[PDB]
């Protein structure tokens, strides 16, 4: 969920 | 190049204040990049390694967690190491992370190994942190120097002809190990093809064959693709990283694949551990784990 290039 | 001085200063912050920096000189770091790049190019792009060794997944600039992993598993060269990529971006201390790893590669080039992750790539690290860290703490010229070094990293490794290791996963274009060996360096990571998939792809329990990847590039692959691949190449296990897993390690396709993620407290939706896989002389696998805080 950090941003999908990836939680 | 004073390797021992560089390593000593990097290890000196063990037990220090939360996130104390180690600021090497720009000439020292350039030396680290140039000497390690030369070593990477002199060694195969598809590494052939021997057990026993320890294998680490993503570090993502969490330098103090890298130090804990070396504390738990033994600082080089007390144990042989294979890292599966993604040393930079996201974290607060990518520079200390990559500098200690490159220093260890130069000091122990036959007992310490680093694979390329999808974050060892200029277009990715321009977005996800390493560029801003280099520009803030050094300059963009040094960041280009890192990229020149990243472009020469090896892409895969096979441990004792049985454990296939890469950062991402399998490829629909990967039919022969010679295809990996034919890849020329230096090279960037392409947005498609074998090299891309080896650094980007993911296994999926809910896919049959090859599917679309939520990351917007490469593919997903199912348990049967893994099974067929191990049979065709006479392998026992695929070892990869790239995906955050809650326990730090997660097996897949009836223990035919394992995912390693070594950066704890990383994910925003759940508290993940970081795991390091110990492979003993007979290729038996155990784990050393950084539990979440
Ligand atoms: Mn990755």
UniProtKB/Swiss-Prot annotation, chain B:
- Localized where? Cytoplasm; Nucleus; Nucleus, Nucleoplasm; Nucleus, Nucleolus
Q: In the UniProt record, does the keyword Manganese occur?
A: yes
Catalyses which reaction(s)? O-phospho-L-seryl-[protein] + H2O = L-seryl-[protein] + phosphate; O-phospho-L-threonyl-[protein] + H2O = L-threonyl-[protein] + phosphate
| SMART domains xref list | PP2Ac
Give binding positions for Mn(2+) 2: 58, 86, 118, 167, 242
Summarize where Mn(2+) 1 binds, as residue positions: 58, 60, 86
A molecular function (GO) term: RNA polymerase II CTD heptapeptide repeat S5 phosphatase activity
Q: How is the cofactor bound?
A: Binds 1 Fe cation per subunit.
Which Gene Ontology cellular-component terms appear in the entry?
adherens junction; cytoplasm; cytosol; dendritic spine; extracellular exosome; glutamatergic synapse; glycogen granule; nucleolus
Q: Cite the record's note on assembly.
A: PP1 comprises a catalytic subunit, PPP1CA, PPP1CB or PPP1CC, which is folded into its native form by inhibitor 2 and glycogen synthetase kinase 3, and then complexed to one or several targeting or regulatory subunits. PPP1R12A, PPP1R12B and PPP1R12C mediate binding to myosin. PPP1R3A (in skeletal muscle), PPP1R3B (in liver), PPP1R3C, PPP1R3D and PPP1R3F (in brain) mediate binding to glycogen. Interacts with PPP1R39. Interacts with BTBD10. Interacts with KCTD20. Interacts with PPP1R9A and PPP1R9B. Part of a complex containing PPP1R15B, PP1 and NCK1/2.
Protein name, UniProt field: Serine/threonine-protein phosphatase PP1-alpha catalytic subunit
Question: Whose protein is this, by species?
Answer: Homo sapiens (Human)
């Amino acid at each position: 969920x950090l941003x999908r290039x990836x939680x | 190049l004073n390797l021992d001085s560089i390593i000593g200063r990097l290890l000196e912050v063990q037990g220090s204040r939360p996130g104390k920096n180690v600021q090497l000189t720009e000439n020292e770091i350039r030396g680290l990049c140039l000497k390690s790049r030369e070593i990477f190019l002199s060694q195969p792009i598809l590494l052939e390694l021997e057990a026993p060794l320890k294998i680490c997944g993503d570090i993502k600039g969490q330098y103090y967690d890298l130090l804990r992993l070396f504390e738990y598993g033994g600082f080089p060269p007390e144990s042989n190491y294979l890292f599966l990529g993604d040393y930079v971006d996201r974290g607060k201390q990518s520079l200390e992370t990559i500098c200690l790893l490159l220093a260890y590669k130069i000091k122990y080039p036959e007992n310490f190994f680093l694979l390329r992750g999808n974050h060892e790539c200029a277009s990715i690290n321009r977005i996800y942190g390493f560029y801003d860290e280099c520009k803030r703490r050094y300059n963009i010229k040094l960041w280009k120097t890192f990229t020149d070094c990243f472009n020469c990293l090896p892409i895969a490794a096979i441990v004792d002809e049985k454990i296939f290791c890469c950062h991402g996963g399998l490829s629909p274009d990967l039919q022969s190990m010679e295809q990996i060996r034919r890849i020329m360096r230096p090279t960037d990571v392409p947005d498609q093809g074998l090299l891309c998939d080896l650094l980007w792809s993911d296994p999926d329990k809910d896919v049959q064959g090859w599917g679309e990847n939520d990351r917007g590039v490469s593919f997903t692959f199912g348990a049967e693709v893994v099974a067929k691949f191990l049979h065709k190449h006479d392998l026992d296990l695929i070892c990869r990283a790239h995906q955050v897993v809650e326990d730090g390690y997660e097996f897949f396709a009836k223990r035919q694949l394992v995912t390693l993620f070594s950066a704890p407290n990383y994910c925003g939706e759940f508290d993940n551990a970081g795991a390091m896989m110990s492979v003993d002389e007979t290729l038996m696998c155990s784990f050393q784990i950084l539990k979440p805080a």
